[PDB]
Amino acid sequence: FQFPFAEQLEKVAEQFPTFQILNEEGEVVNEEAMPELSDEQLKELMRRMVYTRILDQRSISLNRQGRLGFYAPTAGQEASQIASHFALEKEDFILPGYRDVPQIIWHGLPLYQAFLFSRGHFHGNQIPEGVNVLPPQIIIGAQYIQAAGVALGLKMRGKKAVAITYTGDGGTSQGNFYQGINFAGAFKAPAIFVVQNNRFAISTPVEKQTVAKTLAQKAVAAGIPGIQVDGMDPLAVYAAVKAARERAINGEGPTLIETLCFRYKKDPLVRFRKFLEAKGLWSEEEENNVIEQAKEEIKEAIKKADETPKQKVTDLISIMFEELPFNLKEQYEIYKEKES
Amino acid sequence: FQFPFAEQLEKVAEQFPTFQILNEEGEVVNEEAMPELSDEQLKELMRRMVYTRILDQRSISLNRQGRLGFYAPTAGQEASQIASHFALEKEDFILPGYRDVPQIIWHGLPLYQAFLFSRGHFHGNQIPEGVNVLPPQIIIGAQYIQAAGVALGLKMRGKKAVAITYTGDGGTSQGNFYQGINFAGAFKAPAIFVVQNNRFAISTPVEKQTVAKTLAQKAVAAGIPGIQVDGMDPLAVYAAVKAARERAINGEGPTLIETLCFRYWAKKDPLVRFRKFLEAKGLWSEEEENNVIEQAKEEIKEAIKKADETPKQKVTDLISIMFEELPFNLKEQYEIYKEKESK
Amino acid sequence: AQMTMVQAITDALRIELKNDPNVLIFGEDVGVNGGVFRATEGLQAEFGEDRVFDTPLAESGIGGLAIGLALQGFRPVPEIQFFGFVYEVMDSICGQMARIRYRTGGRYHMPITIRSPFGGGVHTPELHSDSLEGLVAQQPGLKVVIPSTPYDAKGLLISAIRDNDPVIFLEHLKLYRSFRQEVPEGEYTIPIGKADIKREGKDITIIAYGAMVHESLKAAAELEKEGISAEVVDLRTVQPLDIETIIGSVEKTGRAIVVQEAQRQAGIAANVVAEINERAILSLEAPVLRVAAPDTVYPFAQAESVWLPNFKDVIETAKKVMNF
Amino acid sequence: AQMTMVQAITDALRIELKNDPNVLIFGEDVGVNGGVFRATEGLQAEFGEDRVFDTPLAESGIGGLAIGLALQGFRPVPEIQFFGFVYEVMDSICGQMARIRYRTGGRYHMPITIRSPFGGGVHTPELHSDSLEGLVAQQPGLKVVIPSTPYDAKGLLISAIRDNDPVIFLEHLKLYRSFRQEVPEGEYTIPIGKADIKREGKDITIIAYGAMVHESLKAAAELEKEGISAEVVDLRTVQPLDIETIIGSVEKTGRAIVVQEAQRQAGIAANVVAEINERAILSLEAPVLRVAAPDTVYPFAQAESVWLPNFKDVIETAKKVMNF
Amino acid sequence: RVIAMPSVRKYAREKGVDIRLVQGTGKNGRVLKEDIDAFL
Ligand SMILES: Cc1ncc(C[n+]2csc(CCOP(=O)(O)OP(=O)(O)O)c2C)c(N)n1
Ligand SMILES: Cc1ncc(C[n+]2csc(CCOP(=O)(O)OP(=O)(O)O)c2C)c(N)n1
Ligand SMILES: [Mg+2]
Ligand SMILES: [Mg+2]
């Protein structure tokens, strides 16, 4: 006798095939799964992805010049980041990781505040009211357990919104990634869990993280569904997050979505441009317009960041508690005198 | 456009059906999967299970009388605890949870040291050399990541041996449960992970832990084999652990085994079905049962006396076991308590 | 009503559930079971499974659940089954909830109270009785509260739950039902950051918290017979410390000792001693000494009585100070 | 040879790998990559993937791995990428490895050395720079070591590795490559729990560790221009304290300050003050004062220069003590 | 209400000197050690 272990592995693999709608040539390889989007929605998605590419180029530049601080590059991930944000509504709450600044910009965080985050200023994290996002999460996996609680809180108040959160391929090794999806699954909470898989965590291959042949199957441990998507495909990424959003509002619980991407022919811009051009929906001048719009907006935002007054120690003390403890009262005074 | 979500959950869960060789009546319902055990091995497994039942009854009683401290009952889990151990070799290293005292007793921990553990005495945790176990682990899930490291240790030394560890249905909810199996998978390490599911964690049903239909399927997150077994069935438990061991020692990585159990339905008892299976084979009798029972009671009474005769702990004892060589603060405190003891 | 501490806690918790629809209570086995020590008994029956609920067995998850819920308007009161299990929950409490107000420039906040039993003298298993207040007290943006009597316990808990920033409310197991005391019915509050004198004296200040307050009062009584009048300050809150009350007393008496159950290298006693040295050395007749457990891991259960600090160590140390 | 601190650490790690076949180095990105800070640069290439290897992204798992490896007779030297990430792995360091010798009554032991970078002054992102030595110093069965020089780093690390109980070796980021110093080639050890005088003085004792040592040496040179002679004590090991060296210094000078980068409610300064109060209060001309960061979360990067304690804070508090 | 460092209060006590009686020459009235000697 032998347990059918190899069969088991094969059987589970068959449940997680890569979802794709557009190939690298911008041709539709899956009509049945094509999402319903107006010609203007299709053009907006391309505007935002082109905008994001330029934002990445400018941010890299600005960091090298010393004009920005911490910056995690996003070029190549536009479909995964932008097309996934596109499937959301304003009611939806985003819990970003450190690299997921674009999603929260498009959700309504002003650009200059995103730059003040990068530089390390408290004001960059002073999110506007009505904008349902947290500052980027530097502790890997912490956003996953927090998203379970947001989702639960959404379900409790009866709201028709989801919590959505993002992590990388490396983050799937954390204990909190597992707890996030298992708490949400246990509570049938409305959460979308995105894992952006670019195959390396710093220097570490995904093969060193896990012997699991897809990350999406990690959903099985929670009892919830997973989808592995071509993360270089804006339509496949859109359709997956939209299906997960529907599933979640319909009280069916969370979904785990693994996007397979590459950060810098497979370029999401490449295949989407061809998709749109075949339909007379995109032109060089429309694209060159977004590029200019971006550069102008980035320049303005950088200046608005530059005119933000410096932080004082008293400011830092003031934001610790609503009512300050004796020690921080004492220290406010010491630093107020210092600052005078 | 629906994604086939409903189908996915079903098809995956379908990969984890309950493995069973003995039904409640002692009838072989799966003869192909039948493990090769001699007549004497079958008796020995039964002797151990009977003895462990007695140990639970006497330990509950002694605990009530205040002659034991911490005690986590085991009755009903004899197949899961004892049959799984039976599949092991002395080279194998056991990382038990707070409830997995019988496994370490059968691996070679003297019974009076098991009792000193229960009372709260350091000598109870002074594992004899060559008995490859750790004291029972109080932090639910900690044993899982430690086992991944033990197994990697064994692999790096090229030892044909495994690490095995046990947790409950509740403990599958911990981050470290997941990290242990995923690390063992990533390093292809000789580890066997056992999950003992009796449906309750104190007052919390499994259904409040996870919406996963099996706990065995959690293996999928690590990309390693998972097996769900009737944990009231000594032969299924043995067969699954033996198969996990052989895969491991032959260098193919870890396995997760979920055992379905129930703690004290009287029909389900692992002793009931195993007694019938062995009696219908003429390998078990009432005399043999009562010889084991009386032996257990004698040994337990001797163990409890030996525990009673262990000298009481002093603070100086607790200080001296902190480090090989004492840091300055503890040198100071050792002198203070030496004087206090002096007296 | 004459109450035990556990009853005063349960009463605090009913009063806040009734007063505040946003108050939630969750943790392992806190719902239908009514809590491993009955502290949430009757609460789910009265208030519903949607206000008082069980969670999966995962402390880190519980912490993150409380954060999410608090981002969504609720005022979470989770429970960590024993404080020895805080190790797995440290990021969510210290790395996250303590930091959200600061981190968001006041845009979000964390009106969370974490309830956790701890403490020795009842022969609990490993990592159940560990005194870990010293760790949380080192984290900016948390307050840490440790009641010693039923009366304190109830007022401090209502305050703690009203507080719009994270509070760690630590409940000593030995103190849960060790003594009965008249605690008011209805609502009242005690301010967080305020100690009180439990016995007035003039020869020596004894500063204490947790189970060590009783040990200190019991020592004060044996010291009176020797003509030593000891003043007993129960810290109540160990972060922030009530500097005025502590300093006033040492200024009055000119002699002090600090008493804690935790190992000498742990707890908050060194903080107290440093504060006194800094703010009142001109009043000091003698070094401020500390009563504390030995610097070992928490004792194997049978060694508890020889290891834990008690009234006799307090007496011996106070006398050491008097005879300096 | 003239070495930076990172080179002396690499040199210590190289020496231990050659000397002891049981030594193993592992962590996030320490193998092929040679480390986020090149601390393990060249080590895998010289010694193999079986001695120096990478791990999945999980702090908790690394600790557990180190424990199991130690149970199998290896001498693990794991790395945690930044110490702000310790919250994840508190159970295994504090709840497990520090307790195993005691827990098993000496049957098993944990010859483990945890290397972790920490510290500010380089504008790192969130939870990279926090000083969390105060947390691990409160755990019985740990020893905690923090070098400030190339020469100390090598001798202390060799000592840390050969120690048969767990040692946390905290490596300040600002000090990795900040300056060079003559460091003997080959092996030497420095005792754990042993301070030294980095500058002899007669008027005030300045006790420091980590990056605050250089700040105290800088303050001391400014004070000497005004005829104030400071004795700079580098603690080197923050647990346990070198009581003999600290008290001896204070008895000579009669005045003392304790300097740390950590927030005032954190770090280990309160312990040092308390120890001084206890053993040498009769020598004190003035109270023992502390230089420490404000009690806020570690600052947003741009705010580091105004928030972090520097040599000017040391100069100011030293004078406060001279003029008491 | 007298103010005096521990070494002084102790120097006083062992030499039978009541500090409340001794006039202090140190800052803000502080009783210094050579004031105990001056009283003596
Ligand atoms: C808990 C924790 N451990 C380690 C780090 C350091 N770290 C920052 S980015 C990174 C790589 C993460 O890789 P991945 O999850 O794949 O996301 P990616 O950066 O590729 O987008 C690591 C280990 C951290 N921020 N948090
Ligand atoms: C990390 C941790 N959390 C909580 C506890 C307290 N506790 C002890 S047993 C228990 C129930 C565990 O149930 P399960 O995992 O199913 O195992 P079982 O006891 O039923 O065999 C809990 C919550 C603990 N010891 N450790
Ligand atoms: Mg990656
Ligand atoms: Mg169970």
mmCIF file with all atom_site columns, N, CA, C and O in Angstrom, chain A residues 176-187:
data_model
loop_
_atom_site.group_PDB
_atom_site.id
_atom_site.type_symbol
_atom_site.label_atom_id
_atom_site.label_alt_id
_atom_site.label_comp_id
_atom_site.label_asym_id
_atom_site.label_entity_id
_atom_site.label_seq_id
_atom_site.pdbx_PDB_ins_code
_atom_site.Cartn_x
_atom_site.Cartn_y
_atom_site.Cartn_z
_atom_site.occupancy
_atom_site.B_iso_or_equiv
_atom_site.pdbx_formal_charge
_atom_site.auth_seq_id
_atom_site.auth_comp_id
_atom_site.auth_asym_id
_atom_site.auth_atom_id
_atom_site.pdbx_PDB_model_num
ATOM 1  N N  . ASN A 1 176 ? 0.982   36.016 10.232 1.00 0.00 ? 176 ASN A N  1
ATOM 2  C CA . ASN A 1 176 ? -0.154  36.949 10.117 1.00 0.00 ? 176 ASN A CA 1
ATOM 3  C C  . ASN A 1 176 ? -0.934  36.905 8.783  1.00 0.00 ? 176 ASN A C  1
ATOM 4  O O  . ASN A 1 176 ? -2.114  37.223 8.762  1.00 0.00 ? 176 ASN A O  1
ATOM 5  N N  . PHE A 1 177 ? -0.264  36.519 7.694  1.00 0.00 ? 177 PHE A N  1
ATOM 6  C CA . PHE A 1 177 ? -0.905  36.268 6.401  1.00 0.00 ? 177 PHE A CA 1
ATOM 7  C C  . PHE A 1 177 ? -1.934  35.160 6.564  1.00 0.00 ? 177 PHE A C  1
ATOM 8  O O  . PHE A 1 177 ? -3.086  35.312 6.140  1.00 0.00 ? 177 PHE A O  1
ATOM 9  N N  . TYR A 1 178 ? -1.491  34.047 7.162  1.00 0.00 ? 178 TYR A N  1
ATOM 10 C CA . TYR A 1 178 ? -2.352  32.914 7.507  1.00 0.00 ? 178 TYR A CA 1
ATOM 11 C C  . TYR A 1 178 ? -3.485  33.267 8.488  1.00 0.00 ? 178 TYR A C  1
ATOM 12 O O  . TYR A 1 178 ? -4.638  32.899 8.277  1.00 0.00 ? 178 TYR A O  1
ATOM 13 N N  . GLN A 1 179 ? -3.165  33.980 9.558  1.00 0.00 ? 179 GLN A N  1
ATOM 14 C CA . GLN A 1 179 ? -4.194  34.397 10.500 1.00 0.00 ? 179 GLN A CA 1
ATOM 15 C C  . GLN A 1 179 ? -5.219  35.369 9.909  1.00 0.00 ? 179 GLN A C  1
ATOM 16 O O  . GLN A 1 179 ? -6.403  35.304 10.253 1.00 0.00 ? 179 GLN A O  1
ATOM 17 N N  . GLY A 1 180 ? -4.766  36.249 9.015  1.00 0.00 ? 180 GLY A N  1
ATOM 18 C CA . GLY A 1 180 ? -5.638  37.213 8.341  1.00 0.00 ? 180 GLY A CA 1
ATOM 19 C C  . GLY A 1 180 ? -6.724  36.539 7.524  1.00 0.00 ? 180 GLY A C  1
ATOM 20 O O  . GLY A 1 180 ? -7.903  36.866 7.660  1.00 0.00 ? 180 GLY A O  1
ATOM 21 N N  . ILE A 1 181 ? -6.318  35.587 6.686  1.00 0.00 ? 181 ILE A N  1
ATOM 22 C CA . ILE A 1 181 ? -7.251  34.853 5.843  1.00 0.00 ? 181 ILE A CA 1
ATOM 23 C C  . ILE A 1 181 ? -8.111  33.839 6.628  1.00 0.00 ? 181 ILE A C  1
ATOM 24 O O  . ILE A 1 181 ? -9.271  33.591 6.267  1.00 0.00 ? 181 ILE A O  1
ATOM 25 N N  . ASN A 1 182 ? -7.559  33.275 7.706  1.00 0.00 ? 182 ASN A N  1
ATOM 26 C CA . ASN A 1 182 ? -8.304  32.308 8.515  1.00 0.00 ? 182 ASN A CA 1
ATOM 27 C C  . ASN A 1 182 ? -9.307  32.997 9.450  1.00 0.00 ? 182 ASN A C  1
ATOM 28 O O  . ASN A 1 182 ? -10.386 32.470 9.703  1.00 0.00 ? 182 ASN A O  1
ATOM 29 N N  . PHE A 1 183 ? -8.975  34.179 9.954  1.00 0.00 ? 183 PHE A N  1
ATOM 30 C CA . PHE A 1 183 ? -9.957  34.921 10.753 1.00 0.00 ? 183 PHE A CA 1
ATOM 31 C C  . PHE A 1 183 ? -11.126 35.379 9.861  1.00 0.00 ? 183 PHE A C  1
ATOM 32 O O  . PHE A 1 183 ? -12.290 35.182 10.215 1.00 0.00 ? 183 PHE A O  1
ATOM 33 N N  . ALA A 1 184 ? -10.804 35.946 8.697  1.00 0.00 ? 184 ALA A N  1
ATOM 34 C CA . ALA A 1 184 ? -11.812 36.430 7.744  1.00 0.00 ? 184 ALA A CA 1
ATOM 35 C C  . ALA A 1 184 ? -12.713 35.290 7.255  1.00 0.00 ? 184 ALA A C  1
ATOM 36 O O  . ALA A 1 184 ? -13.916 35.445 7.200  1.00 0.00 ? 184 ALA A O  1
ATOM 37 N N  . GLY A 1 185 ? -12.118 34.148 6.919  1.00 0.00 ? 185 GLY A N  1
ATOM 38 C CA . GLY A 1 185 ? -12.863 32.951 6.538  1.00 0.00 ? 185 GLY A CA 1
ATOM 39 C C  . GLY A 1 185 ? -13.751 32.416 7.654  1.00 0.00 ? 185 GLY A C  1
ATOM 40 O O  . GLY A 1 185 ? -14.899 32.054 7.415  1.00 0.00 ? 185 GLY A O  1
ATOM 41 N N  . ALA A 1 186 ? -13.228 32.366 8.878  1.00 0.00 ? 186 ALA A N  1
ATOM 42 C CA . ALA A 1 186 ? -14.015 31.916 10.031 1.00 0.00 ? 186 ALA A CA 1
ATOM 43 C C  . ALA A 1 186 ? -15.205 32.823 10.292 1.00 0.00 ? 186 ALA A C  1
ATOM 44 O O  . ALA A 1 186 ? -16.280 32.341 10.664 1.00 0.00 ? 186 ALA A O  1
ATOM 45 N N  . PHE A 1 187 ? -15.015 34.128 10.114 1.00 0.00 ? 187 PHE A N  1
ATOM 46 C CA . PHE A 1 187 ? -16.094 35.092 10.335 1.00 0.00 ? 187 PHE A CA 1
ATOM 47 C C  . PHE A 1 187 ? -16.886 35.421 9.058  1.00 0.00 ? 187 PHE A C  1
ATOM 48 O O  . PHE A 1 187 ? -17.719 36.333 9.058  1.00 0.00 ? 187 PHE A O  1
#
